[PDB]
Design a protein around this ligand. Structure first.
Ligand SMILES: O=c1ccn([C@@H]2O[C@H](COP(=O)(O)OP(=O)(O)O[C@H]3O[C@H](CO)[C@@H](O)[C@H](O)[C@H]3O)[C@@H](O)[C@H]2O)c(=O)[nH]1
Ligand SMILES: O=c1ccn([C@@H]2O[C@H](COP(=O)(O)OP(=O)(O)O[C@H]3O[C@H](CO)[C@@H](O)[C@H](O)[C@H]3O)[C@@H](O)[C@H]2O)c(=O)[nH]1
Ligand SMILES: O=c1ccn([C@@H]2O[C@H](COP(=O)(O)OP(=O)(O)O[C@H]3O[C@H](CO)[C@@H](O)[C@H](O)[C@H]3O)[C@@H](O)[C@H]2O)c(=O)[nH]1
Ligand SMILES: O=c1ccn([C@@H]2O[C@H](COP(=O)(O)OP(=O)(O)O[C@H]3O[C@H](CO)[C@@H](O)[C@H](O)[C@H]3O)[C@@H](O)[C@H]2O)c(=O)[nH]1
Ligand SMILES: [Mg+2]
Ligand SMILES: [Mg+2]
Ligand SMILES: [Mg+2]
Ligand SMILES: [Mg+2]
Lengths: 316, 316, 316, 316
């Protein structure tokens, strides 16, 4: 009997991952055989510049569970993951890395948490460990900032290693977004979510020169995709500055009448500067409010997500 | 004979509404039985953190008229109402609250007004009563402001308790909008609209610490979704300021030629400040006009709504 | 034999047009009978506040050529025309006014020009005549301005009285736009276009107190929907102002070194003011360029329009 | 046996190309007959103002390989090319010019490079030659700038003469964009790309008065469609200016306390000017970041492009 129903999809983005395919596939097979479930392995070639696709085709010829999504260009790991998840058909989908920095054995644990009713199972590191103090402090500050500014609650130490139920995968597919912060998006599609702790081996504990410009832009993407306060604060700042300018002008007139001293030219210049700056900041704040509305409209997120229905059929 | 056609949908958003389901359903059944019409009760669980969904499933098992829309997350009362209306199939749809602050008996009156040809029947409180003076004054000022700025006429004292005909429900479904002001949207879909007065009981007359930041943001949403004047005023303000700067410069030159006194440096600085501020305000106004056009485009409201046709079929 | 193919659609937007329906329909029938072609009359009730819809239904009961599009609200004459054209099915579509200020007899002439191969036949007044000098001068200046700024060539003295071939009607339907300047849109869908001159009778020559705020907003819509120069000029203005500030600073330093006089504080303030204003104007210009790109994207106009094909089928 | 499968499409945009059709078609037939492949010639009349369409119809009557796309208006060469490619159905598509400035014989070479597995084959001039020094320097500077700012790598000396595989054509059709920089778009859809060198004949080496305003706007389109840095730089500039203002104020206070001299009015004015300018530049930078996100959303580019699949079917 052929099930024809994939229970588990393993999505691996690959970029120059030759001389890693054999070990990765051996470990994955060793982990996935005891699970006794139908599975597929979607390997997404993200424009590799070496003999990765050739070895992938060699493995695909012999192993029926291997499928290849060959992207035209190198789009990056996140976009390769998105493509692999788009082409995945399992009831659960697990993104994993080809270098096996995240132990594939934990897949089993994830599957267990998936069978207890959880729709998202994050694989979270117990501690950051090998990451430098600067990286840890910046990550902690970013998470605190995004928690304060936004209404989403991104769990700590969560990477791309996770299990997503088919329902969560379809919810993520319902989000047409070109500027995606995946951590915030997974927090936003709030289903039954849990986490499984795992200690990453010292082989991959810390070895990375982080490009802090890329990290800064990633944090900016996360903040801007889920908060509009940076656009709203300016109208109130302009109102405060204009009020200060008006109060200063009133005080200058009061000193002119009660002391008989004409207002100095620099004081009038300061009043005009503050008033014009506040008016322009109010205009910028109104523009920012309307631009936030436009951004919300063009992100085109669903108003809601239905997780379960009783007595009703799902709307197309 | 099975009608298979729901005449009335009752949409109830629920968030932690356990220990209220029994009384709510008993009152609703007592009201809806004499109506002698087929009905459904769409209960929308908006991510309740207690045993609300369990009791909802218990009620759904026994009562065939109860259906449950279980949202993945807590999206808020308005979004839960939107989801329930999306899943409703009655000829008329009535959003009601689970705490029964709005008397369900008035449903009957609403249905009567629905059978007289009205497409929207608002349930309006006779007086605000228990609301504090600050709340009443802010609401009155907001309604006056939105009436002056916009072309819509939002009726006073209207809440979410209302009856919408299927035609109005479909018109609202035709509005893809992520930043929705529902009061203004219902005013904008102008069908045959009336209201039914009702005095809310002292049990729910006034007990609420209003978060005026949330109210302010709600008013901002309402003003910005139906008015573009806050974007347009800035170009005229900049034109006025630039004209004043040019007139001041002309007066300074006139005093330089007729009195033989060279222009003081502070006067020239003031002229430059005013001219640059006016030019930047004109630029901000042009940007605001184009941003208002962009906002109108991305709101993607239908150009018109057809209420009735004679000799023609409805366009798909 | 029943043709079942409407050759001509007459679209009439109506708002409080009772006591005009009898004369309008009599004149239209007198004009359209000699044409010996199948026709329909789409009357669009734009939320009339009198017994217009009742008389329209009375006429529709007896006359098989009358169809009624009843809009939910009063959306305005232009939107009512858009709805009527959307519901029209004739090979040619002619928008006409219910008061018959434009002679329906000219319809015949329009039809003639339609049979000579022209896709758009404008009905143009020979002279403005009754319009005041202010109105004529403002219209002439607006048309000159829109001709200079844009690449479209809006013909003079063209109103809503025109004939549009089905191909032009479908091209206009291909333009999803919520901020529409119909004159510019018809110029933009450039098919075989001609005009027929007609002298409007003194009964409707001039009687109108034009709301120049509405006319100004209409002109702004026309300019902004087909020109982006108001967004682009600001970056060049800022560049010029910044260059002037830098040159002034250089001249001040040159006078400081060649004359031994330290730069006065007001001169340094002026340099800073001009430099900051120019930098902010460059920023506003870059924002305006990107906003113009966004506006072009969200207007979603077709890249091209195909008028004829040889050896190919039309793309869906 | 009728193949019914076009192997090669030749897309020719034509604008006033009468007295060139005979030579163009003779040369094209001479080149395309030895290829021994099925082909079509899509001639796109871009609103020609002479007897171009008549001769095109005459040629289409006799030659079964000629098809005509008659655009309603003159939309420009690039849009005419887009329409012709949209109506092309060959496995490979080659845009060529009607004046035959690019030798059609090179088509053969392109086809050869297409059969070696390349999806895009650019026809690149060996040297610019006849172009003036100003044109060459501006082109080189523009290409260096777009290479530095963006992540795309536009090949040098590439024109519209190229071969695109059906897969690349479909990828380009997947890009709904009204503001298109085709060079950057072809760089962005990164498939197997190569180039074929060709020396353009002295008949077309250099004869052109380039409109540098149009070239400047084209370069602006290219930079803005693939870079957001012009929107991002302003927040950092504002931060720097605000920091300088704060440092200047601190230095002034330090001199006030350590020297006992009250701060001059011009110094305080300068501090206020710099602080307000920096705050407004930060606001403009935040607006620019959000506007860049909006532009990315409304460009609606696909997240990825799949070039090949193994074990999976293409997603609809
Ligand atoms: O453009 C691409 C496309 C796919 N992949 C795949 O992504 C998987 C793992 O990516 P990897 O580069 O090994 O990242 P990590 O090991 O998880 O750690 C990263 O941590 C930083 C951000 O997490 C990155 O900037 C660093 O490159 C890297 O050390 C592998 O299968 C790769 O093939 C890439 O890395 N880059
Ligand atoms: O996130 C949610 C989702 C659903 N519901 C449902 O909405 C119904 C009624 O909502 P409720 O909180 O009782 O509001 P009201 O009784 O109508 O009065 C409100 O008046 C203010 C705005 O109307 C609110 O901010 C206050 O929370 C509240 O006092 C109930 O079925 C709730 O279960 C919520 O209230 N919050
Ligand atoms: O909201 C609506 C909906 C439909 N119509 C119909 O439009 C037709 C003609 O409109 P009308 O008001 O008579 O305009 P005109 O006679 O063409 O002249 C106008 O010229 C100005 C702009 O053209 C308008 O602002 C003035 O109201 C009016 O004098 C009639 O069938 C009306 O019923 C309106 O006028 N207003
Ligand atoms: O609006 C249109 C529509 C179609 N075509 C067709 O495009 C082909 C070639 O265009 P052409 O005008 O001859 O450009 P080039 O010979 O490639 O060189 C150009 O180089 C510059 C930009 O490449 C242009 O601005 C100059 O007009 C021109 O010298 C011909 O089949 C034309 O019919 C146009 O040129 N303009
Ligand atoms: Mg790794
Ligand atoms: Mg309540
Ligand atoms: Mg009239
Ligand atoms: Mg040429």
């Amino acid at each position: 009997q052929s099930n024809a129903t994939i229970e588990l999809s393993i999505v691996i983005p690959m970029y120059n991952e030759e001389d890693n395919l054999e070990h990765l596939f051996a470990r994955l097979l060793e982990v996935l055989t005891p699970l006794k479930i139908t599975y597929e392995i979607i390997c997404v070639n993200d424009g590799s510049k070496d003999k990765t696709l050739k070895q992938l085709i060699d493995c695909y010829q012999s192993n029926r569970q291997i499928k290849i999504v060959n992207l035209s260009r190198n789009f990056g790991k996140e976009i390769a993951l998105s493509a692999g998840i788009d082409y995945a058909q399992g009831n659960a989908v697990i993104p994993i890395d080809a270098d096996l920095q995240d132990p594939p054995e934990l897949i089993h644990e994830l599957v267990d948490k998936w069978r207890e009713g959880y729709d998202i199972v994050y694989a979270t590191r117990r501690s950051r460990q090998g990451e430098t103090w600067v990286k840890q402090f910046t990550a902690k500050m970013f998470y605190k900032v995004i928690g304060r500014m936004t209404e989403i609650k991104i769990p700590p130490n969560t990477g791309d290693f996770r299990l997503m139920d088919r329902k969560v995968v379809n919810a993520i597919k319902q989000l047409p977004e070109r500027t995606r912060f995946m951590k915030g998006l997974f927090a936003w599609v709030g289903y039954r979510q849990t986490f499984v702790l795992f200690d990453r081996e010292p082989r991959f504990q810390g070895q990375t020169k982080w490009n802090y410009w890329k990290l800064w832009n990633f944090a900016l993407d996360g903040i801007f995709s889920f908060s509009l306060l940076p656009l709203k604060v300016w109208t109130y700042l302009g109102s405060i500055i204009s009020l200060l300018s008006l109060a200063y002008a009133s005080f200058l007139i009061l000193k002119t009448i009660t002391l008989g001293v004409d207002v100095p030219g620099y004081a009038s210049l300061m009043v005009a500067i503050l008033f014009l700056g506040g008016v322009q900041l109010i205009s910028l704040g109104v523009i920012g409010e309307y631009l936030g509305r436009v951004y919300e409209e063009v992100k085109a997120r669903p108003l809601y997500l239905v997780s379960d229905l009783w007595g009703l059929e799902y709307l197309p």
